[PDB]
Amino acid sequence: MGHHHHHHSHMNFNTILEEILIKRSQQKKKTSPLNYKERLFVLTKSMLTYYEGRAEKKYRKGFIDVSKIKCVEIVKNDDGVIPCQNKYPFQVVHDANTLYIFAPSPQSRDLWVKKLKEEIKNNNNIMIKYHPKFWTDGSYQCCRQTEKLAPGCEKYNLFESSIR
Ligand SMILES: [Zn+2]
């Protein structure tokens, strides 16, 4: 059972950047681990949207608006080892929670963090501070305030001079 097609061309508009990225889903007291889910992510000026044409589960096709984003940075990892197969993760704080996305390469991470900052620079939703560590629910991260969206423990340079 469970064998038929359901493909329709729901194409996104003018893309800035697309890549096969890993979404670490933030679990909370339910039947979910810290799932590393490698999907196709496309960034547009209106929305960051991922792709999962699952021919098995009615899996959650979520999306983030650029205006929902409050902070984008690289994840300066406090741990020894990066858990996922992909390494050099970046973080996207938004209306709900702080999302964590592992890039295949530090090349991918660099360009993604960059382009996201270049979009969210015009938002009035941006916290002047961000969280450097892994915001996992009720865990011992940077400020140990991981419950609800704290306004950042380290200072966020929205316009950071990468210039050498
Ligand atoms: Zn913190």
UniProtKB/Swiss-Prot annotation:
One of its GO terms (molecular function) is non-membrane spanning protein tyrosine kinase activity. The keyword Plastid does not apply. Keywords: Adaptive immunity, ATP-binding, Cell membrane, Cytoplasm, Cytoskeleton, Immunity, Kinase, Lipid-binding, Membrane, Metal-binding, Nucleotide-binding, Phosphoprotein, SH2 domain, SH3 domain, Transferase, Tyrosine-protein kinase, Zinc, Zinc-finger. Undergoes also tyrosine phosphorylation during platelet activation. It is found in: Cytoplasm; Cell membrane; Cytoplasm, Cytoskeleton. It comes from Homo sapiens. This is Tyrosine-protein kinase Tec. One of its GO terms (biological process) is protein phosphorylation. GO terms for cellular component: cytoskeleton; cytosol; plasma membrane. A zinc finger (Btk-type) spans 123-159. The chain holds residues 1 to 154 of 631 of the full protein. Part of a complex composed of EEIG1, TNFRSF11A/RANK, PLCG2, GAB2, TEC and BTK; complex formation increases in the presence of TNFSF11/RANKL. Interacts with INPP5D/SHIP1 and INPPL1/SHIP2. Interacts with CD28, FASLG, FGF2, GRB10, LYN and KIT. Interacts with VAV1 and JAK2. Its main location: cytoplasm. Expressed in a wide range of cells, including hematopoietic cell lines like myeloid, B-, and T-cell lineages. Residues 14-121 form the PH domain. Belongs to the protein kinase superfamily. Tyr protein kinase family. TEC subfamily. The PH domain mediates the binding to inositol polyphosphate and phosphoinositides, leading to its targeting to the plasma membrane. It is extended in the BTK kinase family by a region designated the TH (Tec homology) domain, which consists of about 80 residues preceding the SH3 domain. It comes from the Eukaryota. Non-receptor tyrosine kinase that contributes to signaling from many receptors and participates as a signal transducer in multiple downstream pathways, including regulation of the actin cytoskeleton. Plays a redundant role to ITK in regulation of the adaptive immune response. Regulates the development, function and differentiation of conventional T-cells and nonconventional NKT-cells. Required for TCR-dependent IL2 gene induction. Phosphorylates DOK1, one CD28-specific substrate, and contributes to CD28-signaling. Zn(2+) binds at H131, C142, C143, C153.
